[PDB]
Amino acid sequence: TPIKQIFPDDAFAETIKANLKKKSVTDAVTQNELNSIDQIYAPDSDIKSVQGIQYLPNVRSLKLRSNKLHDISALKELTNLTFLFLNLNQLQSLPNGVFDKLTNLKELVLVENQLQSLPDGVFDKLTNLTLLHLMVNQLQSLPKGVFDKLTNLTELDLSYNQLQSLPEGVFDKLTQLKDLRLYQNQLKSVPDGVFDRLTSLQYIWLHDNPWDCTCPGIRYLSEWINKHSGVVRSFIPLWAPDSAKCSGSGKPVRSIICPT
Amino acid sequence: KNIDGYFKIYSKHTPINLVRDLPQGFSALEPLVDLPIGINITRFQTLL
Amino acid sequence: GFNCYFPLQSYGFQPTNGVGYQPYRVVVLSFELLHAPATVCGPKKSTN
């Protein structure tokens, strides 16, 4: 029997009953058979009312192309998600206590992270996160002592850093990072001590890398490379000192006689 | 001819020396080329 | 500078590296039915 004042959603119910292309209208309805869909695929789905969702646990990931939905109720007791996509530009805070059971999340995207400060122990329990994909992150806030208790993070974005002191063992003991990156690094002021512990280096990037020309700091390394120049590779095969081009000038490095 | 999505061409060469008049007689045209084209045609022209 | 980046970046894939970091080749075809006669179907079979 038809009942009025039950469904608030007209478009959503219409698309549910239309996209499936049922046999006829004279069939029965239930909830277990209707809720077999756990991932809703509805373009520009702006369902806001999610209150009392405790009777519908099977849904895990909800897609929302609703920039207007700023309600915190979408994350008060929704801790079964594994993907995040929210275009909430004015996100100045994150709800706490949702990490009590969040262990089934695999990949997240957190763009426009305007958090200039970070909380303590936020990632402390995330030991199971063996795979993290974080790209074009705006985490300008520098973590303060996170490597020495967690060795589990793999991918990081550390651009525009002025660290004069790198953490100890940040690449040595952490053997789980089989993928190591040093592509076209622009760290002009390299911390002293990088070249020693990298005896397990496999992926080398030395071509067109603009290292400094500080006499006589890097002079010994350049001489050692010159003596054994036959093992390195570059885009174009040329003289070894040419690859380590001096910053700015580019004139031959055999003209200045460095005083002792 | 262009019917049922196909383009058909028939031809025949008949040696008769006559002027300003279509020669009489009978001559059937043998099919030459069939084209699987299947497009809409309304007009035509010539490369004079 | 501020709110500006560069499109051209590279990760690095060499052919002598491990099998998980080497280029491959992919060829993709499509299957559909149209409202026209088919001129590409396949070979035939003949018997004595």
Q: B35 to chain C nearest CA, in Å?
A: 11
- Chains with ≥3 Cβ pairs under 8 A against A? C
A154 contact partners, CB below 8 Å, separation of at least 6: A130, A131, A132, A176, A177, A179
Q: Could you tell me if A148 and A124 are in contact, meaning their C-beta atoms sit under 8 angstroms apart?
A: no
CA separation for the pair A76, A74 (Å, rounded): 6
Q: Backbone phi, then psi, for B22, in 5-degree steps?
A: -70, 125
- What is the spatial distance between Cα A48 and Cα A46, in angstroms, rounded to a whole number? 6
A143 within 8 A of A166, measured Cβ to Cβ: no
CA angle (A215 as vertex; A212, A217 as ends), nearest 5: 75
Resolution (A): 3.3
**Cα–Cα dist B42/C14, whole Å:** 59
- In the numeric block, which tokens belong to residue A29? 């309805």
B38/C39 CB distance under 8 A: no
Q: Amino acid letter at C44?
A: K
CA distance C23 to chain A (A): 17
Identify the sign of the CA torsion A69, A72, A76, A81.
positive
- Count the neighbouring beta carbons within 10 Å of the beta carbon of residue A74: 19
- Label the pairing between strands B2-3 and B30-35: unpaired
C38 touches chain B (CB under 8 A): no
A184 touches chain C (CB under 8 A): yes
Closest-CA distance, C9 to chain B, in angstroms, reads: 48
Structural contact between residues A66 and A48, judged by C-beta atoms closer than 8 angstroms: yes
To which residue do tokens 């076209």 refer? A184
* Cβ proximity of A234 and A214 under 8 Å: no
Touch test B–C: 3 Cβ pairs or more under 8 Å:
yes
In angstroms, the CA A91 to CA A57 distance is 26
Tell me how many degrees the CA angle A229-A235-A239 measures, rounded to the nearest 5.
35
- Look at residues C28, A190, A56, A86 and name the one whose alpha carbon lies nearest to residue A182: A190
Touching partners of C (3+ C-beta pairs < 8 Å): A, B
Kindly report the nearest CA distance between residue C20 and chain A, in angstroms. 11
Provide CB contacts within 8 A for A98, sequence distance 6+. Answer: A75, A79
Tokens of A155: 């991918």
Residue A47 and residue A12 in contact, taking contact as beta carbons nearer than 8 Å: yes
According to DSSP, residue A173 is labeled T
Q: Do residue B5 and residue C36 have CB atoms under 8 angstroms apart?
A: yes
How far is the C-alpha of A226 from the C-alpha of C8, rounded, in Å? 31
Interface test mutation site (partner A, options C3, C6, C8, C11, max chain A beta carbons within 10 A)? C11
A37: nearest Cα among A54, A20, A59: A59
Q: Are B5 and B28 in contact (CB under 8 A)?
A: no
Residue A235 touches partner C, C-beta closer than 8 Å: no
User: Chain B interface residues facing chain C, Cβ-Cβ under 8 Å?
Assistant: 5, 36, 38
Burial of A40-70, coded b for 16+ CB within 10 Å and e otherwise, reads eeeeebeeeebeeeeeeeebeebebebeebe
